[PDB]
Amino acid sequence: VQLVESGGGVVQPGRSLTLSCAASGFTFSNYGMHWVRQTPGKGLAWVAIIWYDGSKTYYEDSVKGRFTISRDNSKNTLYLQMNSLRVDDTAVYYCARVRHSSSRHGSAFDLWGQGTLVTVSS
Amino acid sequence: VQLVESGGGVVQPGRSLTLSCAASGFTFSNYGMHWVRQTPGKGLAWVAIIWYDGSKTYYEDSVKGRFTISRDNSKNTLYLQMNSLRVDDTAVYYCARVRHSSSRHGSAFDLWGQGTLVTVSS
Amino acid sequence: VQLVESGGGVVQPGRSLTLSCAASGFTFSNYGMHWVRQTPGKGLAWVAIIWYDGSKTYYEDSVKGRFTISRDNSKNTLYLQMNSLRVDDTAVYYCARVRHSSSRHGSAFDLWGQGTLVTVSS
Amino acid sequence: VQLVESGGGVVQPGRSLTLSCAASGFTFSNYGMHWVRQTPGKGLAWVAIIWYDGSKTYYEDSVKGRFTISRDNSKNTLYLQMNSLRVDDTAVYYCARVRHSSSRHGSAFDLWGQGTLVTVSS
Amino acid sequence: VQLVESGGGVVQPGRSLTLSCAASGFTFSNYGMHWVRQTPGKGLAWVAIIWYDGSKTYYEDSVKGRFTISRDNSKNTLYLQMNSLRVDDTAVYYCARVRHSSSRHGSAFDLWGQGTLVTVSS
Amino acid sequence: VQLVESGGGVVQPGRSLTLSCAASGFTFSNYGMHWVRQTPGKGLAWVAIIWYDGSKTYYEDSVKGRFTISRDNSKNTLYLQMNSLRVDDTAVYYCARVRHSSSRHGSAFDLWGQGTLVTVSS
Amino acid sequence: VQLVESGGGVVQPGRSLTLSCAASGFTFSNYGMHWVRQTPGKGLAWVAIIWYDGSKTYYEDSVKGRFTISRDNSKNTLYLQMNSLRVDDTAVYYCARVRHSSSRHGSAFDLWGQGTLVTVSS
Amino acid sequence: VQLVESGGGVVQPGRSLTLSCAASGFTFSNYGMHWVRQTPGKGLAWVAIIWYDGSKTYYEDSVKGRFTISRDNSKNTLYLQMNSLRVDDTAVYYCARVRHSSSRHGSAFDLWGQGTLVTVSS
Amino acid sequence: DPNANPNVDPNANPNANPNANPNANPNANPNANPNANPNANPNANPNANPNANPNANPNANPNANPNANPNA
Amino acid sequence: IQMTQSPSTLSASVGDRVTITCRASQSVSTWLAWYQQKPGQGPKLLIYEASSLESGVPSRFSGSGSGTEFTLTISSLQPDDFATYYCQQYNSYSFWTFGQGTKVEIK
Amino acid sequence: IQMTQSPSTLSASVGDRVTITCRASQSVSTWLAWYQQKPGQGPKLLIYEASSLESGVPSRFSGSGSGTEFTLTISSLQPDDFATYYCQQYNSYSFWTFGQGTKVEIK
Amino acid sequence: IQMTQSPSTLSASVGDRVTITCRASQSVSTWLAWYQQKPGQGPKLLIYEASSLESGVPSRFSGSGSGTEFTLTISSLQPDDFATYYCQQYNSYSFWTFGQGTKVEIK
Amino acid sequence: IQMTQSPSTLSASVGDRVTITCRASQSVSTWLAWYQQKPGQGPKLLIYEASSLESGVPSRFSGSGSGTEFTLTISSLQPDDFATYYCQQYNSYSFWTFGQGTKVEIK
Amino acid sequence: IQMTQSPSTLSASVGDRVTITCRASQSVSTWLAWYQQKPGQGPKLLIYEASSLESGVPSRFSGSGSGTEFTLTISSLQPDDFATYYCQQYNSYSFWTFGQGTKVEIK
């Protein structure tokens, strides 16, 4: 049960950077995933959700229209494509796997990756 | 975000007319929708509601059994089909989107179309 | 708009008999329904209530633990599984539909069935 | 019907302790429940009430801001989370079920538990 | 606990002004609240009363029909809509909370706000 | 502030007739009301009183057990259901509103209705 | 118009015996009541009076401090509890109703119960 | 329509055993099958499911990673490769065919095999 | 004064009595209120409920889907 | 809540005036409904909340009252309206209970 | 509302008549309940609304009174009815308070 | 539930203070919304829950009230605030109903 | 989702009436099935979706229920109906589980 | 829903008892989860649904609460359990929001 991020680095404001999240050891195509930011000095903040098929996605209000989350069930990977980055968006990005739940109300995020630092500065 | 109606016109009493309502620029398969009349010389009047899936539907008591409302989530389109139109039913028809509410009690109609004119006369 | 029951007959004391109630002509999943007896030589007596979901059920104090009312919105059907019948329960059983009320205090029974005769004797 | 608590033990002054109260054999989400102490050498004393939803709550004048009662209707439990315990709070804590009353003035406690001993000392 | 008003200012005679009163630190939906004037050169004078639910209101004989007191339990506020203002109504308005009382006769005004100044002049 | 009654007519002796009283322009659920006759050739005469809640009623000595008085606070109505009429009941029935008074002794009838003629004859 | 006593019997000196008195056929909440004893060989003797609310009570000098009179207007009952009964209290206890009077001085006893025999002996 | 299995027997713990399930008389490639155990002294227990093509499989939590279910549509045959058997795993293994359903929520197991014996001991 | 009319004083004030305890009445009936509207609540949230189970629905129709694309 | 009706049997002729009295053992406020059950059929609601008329009910039927005393008045009895009338109460915290039923017969 | 009971401890024999008096500091109308707590167990309801019996309680127990004077009378004390009895009041605008409780001991 | 607004016509000038009042025939709690329909267009939400502001609406508009009395207040009338303002209620078990609307004209 | 069946053993004779009760620890909607396993054979479906009948099953078998309480009713027991009956649930997001199974024996 | 925690920093030693309080601005029913993020790693689930325990987590961790008051109680603080704990809510119609994090420090 392994979940590894990638794609981090340093970019200038307004430039586009794309992340990936390679899953390992479990059926990736069976779970809905989240992306969660951690800006030091604050707690975790949610970013996007992907609905196990690509059919439904929901974003935070501050990233709507700039972040495009998509998944690839064939290679067990996620993708959070960022466009028009700002100095606000520098944080550590985590993947989250939604726990299996015997209901219709979802569940917490059991498996979290190690995160890759995204730095936006000039 | 854009919401425009169509399909209006002039028909004789007792005939059938169908309206369509194309929604664009937003996730249509997530919102419950309405139809609203505006008779000149009167206020706005509610007509029907569709429950985000086609699962549940309520009508005004004066149009029960004559109006059918149904939605096509794949094409982002509403349909209110009129049967046995009367002289009363001459008004302007608007689609109304139910606002997102962080509760179980719904919300107001935020995004309204430009409306279409339906005239019933002999 | 019709509401018809079935499942009556003659059973010996202590045996279990199950009643059904098929609803037609209206949206059945929106109404909380009741079961009402009519013992000859007595007036109508209330039996059980089902709360529009199966979430809440209340019974008359004389049938608690022997009667189980459950509904099936998928087939528009009620059920009142009667266990451990006694000679008292020989009565005609009616279905009742609770009227819509613009409040939280409930309303009277507008739609009544035709009654199925249950006889418990040796 | 049965009403059994747990979570007792010995804690030092200033620490926090949480009690639980599992209800079995009856519908728990319909009854507003209480918590009652019993200090040896003194009579019973009321502690808190929960209003059948968690919507409304009331406490004894000497435990406001130190005791928090909340209920979980999905699992049929109570929780009287005790904070800032003192040597005064050495007592046995009972649960109580409010009897059904055909009025608006409530009724007495009809179902009591066996109590858990909570000792605060150093 | 605290009780702070707002919405004051200067308006011309005959204009309409809306006052607000936000309550914090206690369960606001539990207490019936009052509005009290303070005209310099005269003692305090009562204005209205709200009955913990909005069900019952009673006004001063000189402001009946020009003042509307209403409360919102969800956002913990009070409102006193003042219509047809006159030069006499220049006074500081206070919020008051009715003390809990173990009887059917109410109690005094214990928690008072800091008051807002309403001036009507030409 | 308008008070109108209804339900008059001519009925043969021994029959049951129900009067009514409609209240508008004031909070009807705050005042206790009366019913008063005016028989031509004689002065007024009190008939019944309702105590703002339906808790207490009182009647003239000559109509006890035949006239019942009751009020619907939700619909702002009064009812004087008259049973077993005689020829002596030929009169005009008024509604009377008891004026607010700052004591424990009541006040005179301040607002009177217009009156409905009830005639009993063979 | 019926007033029935109960609760009589035989007790040893020094014990405590309580009596009951039910009223029916008239509104019990609107009348003050008396208890009157009848010792064979002696005339009627007053014992206690209840002031229509329990607000005021008065006792005979011979039973002050040992007799309690109280009424329950919700069930239309009277309660005269006798503590430390003596041999001289052997008599028949009647309930008396004070008739309506159009003054502030009261009136005679209108309705009397059949009475219950209470005897004290060794 | 027949479902016959084989490949059972007796093996020591820690070894590997392979079961088979030959289907005949129907289009085996159209059906998602199950494996079901029956241990005497206990009811049936589900084991694995195969999703009509090999895309998805789900196992009971106690056999995850030790039981590998697979199918071969060209030979109309299931395969449950068992690895690291324990004394718990002795039971009778049944194949189950999922009944055709006109929905998306599955159906019951209509066709069952004759069962095969898998015994593990030292 | 033992002798004083212990009746109700029918000529009393039958009005609303504005000075009544306007507080919350902490001793009330905290129960289910069985006679409550057992209906569909037409004004319920008709939206999408974003916080719903985004998982795989392990119990779904594993059959062949006879109405599938019969072309190339 | 014990609910009783009087008179138990009410003889009346076509075009006469009919009043049926329903008494409740406790205060049921305005929560009360009136029914009508012709022989061999199921009862049909006529009046709800003790005053309002159900849709489709003829205007002849009317009801009034509050507290514990309710009456149902038929202004003009028709040949249709000869049936057994039942009285129901549904208070706030009380369950639904029905009266014994008065039978209206031709005179 | 402070509730006190007298006597604190009374001894009675099998079949004897027992009266326990509960006195309220202020009028509690008729809202009052009597409990029974055998040692080491949880108290069980006996009488609610100061007169009515809780279902399952033998008709032996009885209670009467209103205002500020209340009593609980055991008509014929049984070998099972030797325990501590508590008095509770729940007025409309008052909170629930319990009396100290009287212990019934075998003579 | 019938909603009526007064005044039906409200003359005002630029920079004035405007209050439009909506009254509900039955208690609608806090569930109420205000719209703005310039002629020839479709109405746009301004206030929901009777107090909040829809995103993008200028801070001039504000609303207050609960129960059956409501009021929409404009702190400073602008050149483009001359349009018909409507009132809506969406209670618990009540359907959506609109008021007749008030028209604001130049003075 | 723990499934329990009661009574575990039910003695009955030919031509009698047999009802077997299946209870689910959580609400399983209407997704439930009933099986019958004669000794030494493989179980065969009887009822699916908790109400419908499998093709070819005799019309004697019938079932009803929804939520947590399910029952199976045999109108006329037959000499080939003496076998073990199992209860299965397949809820939306829950996996398939079985009850312990009741054995219907010859009286 | 704005989510807050208390205390911001908590000092404790090995073998002590630690309680961390999470308070919700709005009712979140029982939907809540507690995480634990050691420095430089990714947070790991500890408690889901605010009461149940995730598989593999030691039985030391426990939680309780419903509505707007939640607590996480550690019966025996180990040298392993010195890390920051986060409070998350996922209500019915609300999105996911986290608390500010309380750091458990060595004393």
Is B112 in the L-facing interface, judged by CB distances under 8 Å?
yes
Structure-token pair, residue H90: 């002795």
**How would you classify the pairing of strands E77-82 and E67-72?**
antiparallel
Touch criterion met for L and N (3+ Cβ pairs within 8 Å): no
Half-sphere exposure of E47 (CA within 13 A, CB side): 25
Report the alpha-carbon distance of residue D111 to residue D97 in Å, rounded: 5
* C-alpha to C-alpha distance for E91 and E88, rounded to whole angstroms: 8
For residue H30, with 0-12 CB atoms within 10 Å meaning exposed, 13-18 middle and 19 or more buried, which class applies? middle
- Residue C102 in contact with residue J49, Cβ under 8 Å? no
Contact J69 F72 (CB under 8 A): no
Give the integer Cα–Cα distance in Å for G3 and H84.
87
Q: Which amino acid is at L106?
A: I
3-state secondary structure labels for all residues of chain A: CEEEEECCEEECCCCCEEEEEEEECCCHHHCCEEEEEECCCCCEEEEEEECCCCCCEEECCCCCCCEEEEEECCCCEEEEEECCCCHHHCEEEEEEEECCCCCCCCCCEEEECCCEEEEECC
D1, D112, D114, D117, best to mutate vs chain K, most K CBs in 10 Å: D112
M8 close to M100: Cβ distance less than 8 angstroms:
yes
Interface check for M91 against chain C (CB to CB < 8 A): the answer is no
Q: Which chain H residue shows the shortest CA-CA distance from I65?
A: H30
Judged by DSSP in three states, M47 sits in: strand
Length of chain N: 107
Please give the interface size between G and I, counted as residue pairs whose CB atoms are below 8 Å apart. 33
Please give, rounded to a whole number of angstroms, the shortest distance from the CA of I38 to a CA of chain L. 11
3-state secondary structure of G106: coil
Residues forming a β-bridge with J1: none
Helical (H) or strand (E) element with F4: strand F2-6
CB-based contact (8 Å) between I12 and chain G? Answer: no
Which chain I residues have a beta carbon less than 8 Å from that of J91? Answer: 35
CA distance A103 to chain M (A): 6
DSSP for chain K reads --EEEE-SEEEE-TT--EEEEEEESS--TT-EEEEEB-TTS--EEEEETTTEEPTTS-TTEEEEEETTEEEEEESS--TT--SEE-EEE--SSS--EE---EEEEE-
What are the CB-based long-range contacts (under 8 Å, 24+) for A21-27? A21/A77, A21/A78, A21/A79, A21/A80, A21/A95, A21/A113, A22/A75, A22/A76, A22/A77, A23/A76, A23/A77, A23/A78, A24/A76, A25/A1, A26/A1, A27/H56, A27/I56
| K contacts of D105 (beta carbons < 8 Å) | 31, 90, 92
> Does residue L88 contact residue L35 with C-beta atoms inside 8 Å?
yes
Extended strands (E) in chain M: 3-6, 9-12, 18-24, 32-37, 44-48, 52-53, 61-66, 69-74, 84-89, 97-98, 102-106
**Side chain identity at residue B70, one-letter code:** S
Spatial separation of the C-alpha atoms in residues L43 and B113, rounded to whole Å: 8
The two structure tokens encoding residue J79? 């040949």
User: Among candidates C94, C98, C101, which has minimal Cα distance to C109?
Assistant: C98
Neighbours of F87 (CB within 10 A): 10
Residues 6+ apart with CB under 8 A from G62: none
Q: State both tokens at E32.
A: 């019936």
Whole-number CA gyration radius for chain K: 13
In this structure, are residues H33 and I44 in contact, taking their beta carbons and an 8 Å threshold? no
Q: Please give the backbone phi and psi of residue B110, each rounded to the nearest 5 degrees, phi first.
A: -90, -60
Distance, CA of C102 to chain centre: 25
Residue A7: C-alpha distances to residues A33, A116, J50 (Å): 17, 7, 72
Q: Are J72 and J19 in contact (CB under 8 A)?
A: yes
Q: Which residues contact B118 (CB under 8 A, 6 or more apart)?
A: B8, B9, B17, B19, B82, B85, B89, B90, B91, B92, B93
CA nearest neighbour of L1 among L101, L107, L99 = L99
Q: Do I28 and D106 touch (CB under 8 A)?
A: yes
If contacts are CB pairs under 8 Å, which of residues 19-58 in chain I contact chain E? 19-24
Residues 6+ apart with CB under 8 A from E84: E14, E16, E66
List the structure tokens of E8. Answer: 């004051």
The 3-state DSSP class for residue B81 equals strand
Residue N49 contacts I where some CB pair is shorter than 8 Å: no
Of I37, I39, I43, the CB nearest to L91: I43
Nearest to D119 by CA among D101, D100, D92: D92
Chains touching chain I, criterion 3+ CB pairs below 8 Å: A, B, C, D, E, F, G, H, J, K, L, M, N
Q: How far is L102 from chain E (nearest CA, A)?
A: 17
- Would an 8 Å CB–CB cutoff place K94 in contact with chain E? yes
Tokens representing residue F98 in the block? 């008891």
Tracing tokens 């993947």 back to the chain, one arrives at A95
Write the DSSP string, chain H: -EEEEE--EEE-TT-EEEEEEEEESS-GGG--EEEEEE-TTS-EEEEEEE-SSSS-EEE-TTSTTTEEEEEETTTTEEEEEEES--GGG-EEEEEEEEPP-SSSS---EEEE---EEEEE--
- The span from the CA of G71 to the CA of G28, in Å, is 10
The answer to whether residue B12 neighbours chain N at the CB level (below 8 Å) is: no
J30 touches chain F (CB under 8 A): yes
Helices (H), C13-107: none
Q: Assign F105 to helix, strand or coil.
A: coil
Give residue for tokens 């390992």.
Answer: A24
**Neighbors of chain D with 3 or more C-beta pairs under 8 Å:** I, J, K, N
Residue H45 contacts residue H29 (beta carbons within 8 Å): no
Please tell me the distance in Å from B93's CA to the nearest CA on chain I: 20
Give the distance from residue G12's alpha carbon to the nearest chain I alpha carbon, in angstroms.
32
DSSP, collapsed to helix, strand or coil, labels residue F88 as: helix
Cβ contact (<8 Å) for E101 and K93? yes
L67, two tokens: 């129960």
Q: For residue M61, what are the CA distances in angstroms to B106, C99, M57, M58?
A: 45, 36, 8, 6
Beta strands in D57-120 (DSSP E): 57-59, 67-72, 77-82, 91-98, 109-112, 116-120
Identify the CATH class of A2-120.
mainly beta
Q: Which of K43, K92, K95 sits opposite D46 (nearest CB)?
A: K95
Query: What six digits make up the tokens of J49?
Result: 């909340």
* Cβ distance of I12 and F105 shorter than 8 Å: yes
Handedness of CA E35, E38, E43, E45 (dihedral sign): negative
Delineate the domains of chain K, giving CATH numbers in brackets: 3-106 (2.60.40.10)
Provide the pairing of β-strand A116-120 with B9-11: unpaired
SS (H, E, C) chain L: CCEEEECCEEEECCCCCEEEEEEECCCCCCCEEEEEECCCCCCEEEEECCCEECCCCCCCEEEEEECCEEEEEECCCCCCCCCEEEEEECCCCCCCEECCCEEEEEC
Closest residue, chain G, to I10 (C-alpha): G30
d(CA B5, CA B17) in angstroms, rounded, equals: 14
Cβ of residue C20 closer than 8 Å to a chain M Cβ = yes
Q: Is J70 helix (H, G, I), strand (E, B) or coil?
A: strand
Whether M96 contacts H34, CB under 8 Å: yes
Q: What are the chain L neighbours of B43 within 8 Å (beta carbons)?
A: 86, 98-101
> Pick from K42, K86, K95: which is nearest to D113 by CB?
K42
In chain I, which among 26-65 make CB contacts under 8 A with chain K?
26-27
Q: Delimit the domains of chain G by residue range.
A: 2-120
What single DSSP character describes residue G36?
A: E
Q: Which residues of M touch C71 (CB under 8 A)?
A: 66
**Quick check: I50 and A58 in contact, CB under 8 A?**
yes
The answer to whether the CB of C50 falls within 8 A of the CB of C31 is no
Task: List chains touching J (3+ CB pairs under 8 A).
Answer: C, D, F, I
J29 touching chain C per CB within 8 A: no
Contact at 8 Å (CB) between J78 and J25? no
Minimal CA separation from B5 to chain L, in Å: 11
Give the length of chain M: 107
C-beta of residue H118 within 8 angstroms of C-beta of residue H17: yes
Torsions phi, psi of F28, nearest 5? -70, -25
Determine whether the interchain pair L48/B44 forms a contact, defined as Cβ–Cβ distance below 8 Å.
no
Are F48 and F58 within 8 A, CB to CB? yes
| Structural determination approach | cryo-EM
Nearest CA in chain J to D101: J93
Question: Distance, in angstroms, between L25 CA and closest chain C CA?
Answer: 13
Q: Is M37 on the interface with C (CB under 8 A)?
A: no
What are the phi and psi torsion angles at L89 (to 5°)? -130, 135
Exposure of A3 in the CB half-sphere (CA atoms within 13 A): 26
In chain L, which residue's Cα lies nearest the Cα of B110?
A: L45
Contact J24, J34 (CB under 8 A): no
The CA distance from H64 to H79, in Å, is 15
| Pairwise CB contact (< 8 Å): I6 & G30 | no
Block residue for tokens 């593999």:
N56
Of I37, I39, I43, which is closest to L90 when you measure between CB atoms? I43
Strand residue runs (E) in chain G:
2-6, 9-11, 16-24, 33-38, 44-50, 57-59, 67-72, 77-83, 91-98, 109-112, 116-120
Q: Among I37, I41, I43, which would you mutate to test the C interface (most chain C Cβ atoms within 10 Å of its Cβ)? A: I37
DSSP secondary-structure letter at E64?
A: B
Would you call I33 and J95 a contact, using CB atoms and an 8 Å cutoff? no
Q: Could you write out the three-class secondary structure of N58-97?
A: CCCEEEEEECCEEEEEECCCCHHHCCEEEEEECCCCCCCE
Of the candidates D44, D45, D108, the beta carbon closest to that of K48 is on D108
Opening angle at CA A13, ends A7 and A17, nearest 5: 20
Q: How many Cβ pairs within 8 Å bridge chains A and I?
A: 38
- The residue behind tokens 């409501």 is L70
Residue of M85, M75, M67 lying closest to M1 (CA atoms): M67
Q: Is D104:J92 a contact under the CB 8 Å cutoff?
A: yes
Touching N (3+ Cβ pairs <8 A), the chains are: A, B, D, I
| Residue K84, CA atoms < 13 Å, CB-side half-sphere | 21
